[PDB]
Symmetry: C2
Subunit: 357 residues, 2 copies
């Protein structure tokens, strides 16, 4: 009967965003998991508490819903699961071992948070409606909640993966074009299965400072894969469906550019395009629910390390999707939400008559 | 001694946004200026009052500054200038005539609002600093103020121009590619004068529903010209300066696309590009002041009729600038700010510790 107490305690702390450089450190090749354990033992509780504190501070219907209250109950379990180690000591080649077992266990317990939280969104639509203010509140909360989750899973993955070339999920020499090819291959496979047709791929890179040298960077390849796969699938479907009465289906072109501080990936298709007004809704969780969240969540993966994901099409022609990542491991630092008085007022919207007419 | 009274009176009203279709009407070929006079006699005072009411409701230093207080005094004059007709009657081929003379007079009086207001921005920077909250407040206010002005000048221009093929400043058959060529020509001229070199132009259009038919639309050609000229100048300078040690300067490519609801113009250059972080500042009045406002104001002209202006580059390669306009005269309606309790709280920012860490 002490969950509320903990949440109240650790929510007083602020999570500590780590640089991509720091991850490499705590990962190294030998760096003892002892440091990780002592660190994670405090940080994880801090991150859980912050997001839980924010959850408990939103409309009672959103709280009383089976989904939100359900995932909330999952986080309560996990919080406790970790407290168990606060008064434990390393040295015991066991204390550490049972920690990972605990982390791995916490991971599977949360494996369905996205689909579940997504279920609450549909319930909300049917229960209260799809007004702009509701959209805003849900959008604001879900971006933070999901980003919070990405980071917690990040920490957990680095630890479990390392402690038993690549530093866990991080590749200090990730070749961007290669991940682009992989994501394309999978998308093509699925495209051929469903449409029995698929556009080809053209890749071009621009290494501003070193003309012919292949482009490499320090990054999490699975994160980049997820973003690119989502984009290829949309670009393929649009290209295919928009040319079902034509025969020349055009190719998807990708450009990978490496500048002084940005590493940019642009994906250009000729899938017909989308009016400007519908672009805005493509990133909304609410407006993209029925009767998926690939795009809004993909954008969160870009933002996680100070990047971004943007779209701009030309209705009647095609669409350009661009992923902006930080070129230097130095500028690559976790983007983490924090529960403040600042965050509180984003939920005080009492909309009813705008400033424009 | 009754200026405050009027402002208080007309600020209780909401301006009335007009469609591009309505402009054509009140413009027609014979439509009597009588209707215009009776309409403008009320609307103009309503628009002036709204913006003036908003001005009087911001920090005393911004008010006490010579610039803001100075333009504010210009608006006070103009408000009075028009009141003079509230108790006047048409029929008198004179009452109307002296109205235009009054409008034309009001126009010249405001001819330097931009440079002047821009002067207050620099003064503010030196007087109070360039903090994010100040930026926000200035950005919010200036976008509305300048948009308000664009509309007032619009009404005034339609009236003065018509009453003495084209319906004033509006061209019901504006050929987009043609305006693109004009804007390019002027920019090239200036480019050659200063740099003694300039990239060429390539134009391509995509008429989705009618393959080879030239693209036309109902619009204000001078508005479109201004936006395109600003973009060409930036694209030329970047292309030139980024290739001063090379010889192959590449061309600026423009695509004009006409879809079911959007008419889009994309301008692509290979001027080297800009990091993502600096893009955000290109639209800020504050962050773009020294020791111009082409971009932020150009964006306002796009937004005026429900359009937009966006930028996205690839650092180390180039930049795409896109102007989104409504394809149909039906969806082309004035975008006007209004003084509400809604607008009031955008100036209540008391920033000090964000929701992200």
């Amino acid at each position: 009967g002490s969950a509320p107490k903990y949440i109240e305690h650790f929510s007083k702390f602020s999570p500590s965003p780590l640089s991509m450089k720091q991850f490499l450190d705590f990962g190294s090749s030998n760096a003892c998991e002892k440091t990780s354990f002592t660190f994670l033992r405090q940080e994880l509780p801090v991150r859980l508490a912050n997001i839980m504190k924010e959850i408990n501070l939103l409309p009672d219907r959103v709280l009383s819903t089976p989904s939100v209250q359900l995932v909330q109950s999952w986080y309560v379990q996990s919080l406790l699961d970790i407290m168990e180690f606060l008064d434990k000591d390393p040295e015991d080649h066991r204390t550490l071992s049972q920690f990972t077992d605990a982390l791995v266990t916490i991971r599977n317990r949360h494996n369905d948070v996205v689909p579940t939280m997504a279920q609450g969104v549909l319930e909300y639509k049917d229960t209260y409606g799809d007004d702009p203010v509701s959209n805003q509140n849900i959008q604001y909360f879900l971006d933070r909640f999901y980003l919070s989750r990405i980071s917690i899973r990040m920490l957990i993955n680095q630890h479990t993966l390392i402690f038993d070339k690549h530093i866990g999920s991080i590749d200090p020499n990730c070749n961007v074009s290669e991940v682009v090819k992989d994501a394309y291959d999978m998308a093509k496979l699925l495209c051929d299965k469903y449409y029995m047709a698929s556009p080809d791929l053209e890749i071009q890179e621009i290494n501003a400072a070193n003309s012919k040298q292949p482009i490499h960077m320090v990054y999490v390849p699975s994160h980049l894969y997820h973003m690119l796969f989502e984009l290829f699938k949309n670009a393929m479907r649009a290209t295919v469906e928009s040319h079902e009465s034509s025969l020349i289906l055009p190719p998807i072109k990708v450009m990978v550019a490496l500048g002084e501080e940005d590493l940019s990936i642009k994906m250009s298709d000729r899938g017909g395009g989308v009016p400007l007004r519908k672009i805005e809704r493509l990133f909304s969780y609410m407006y993209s629910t029925a009767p998926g969240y690939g795009l809004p969540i993909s954008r969160l993966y870009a933002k996680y390390f100070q990047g971004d994901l943007q779209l701009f099409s030309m209705e009647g022609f095609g669409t350009d999707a661009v992923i902006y990542l930080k070129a230097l491991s130095t500028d690559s630092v976790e983007r983490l939400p924090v529960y403040n008085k600042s965050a509180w007022r984003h939920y005080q919207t009492i909309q009813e008559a705008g400033d424009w007419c």
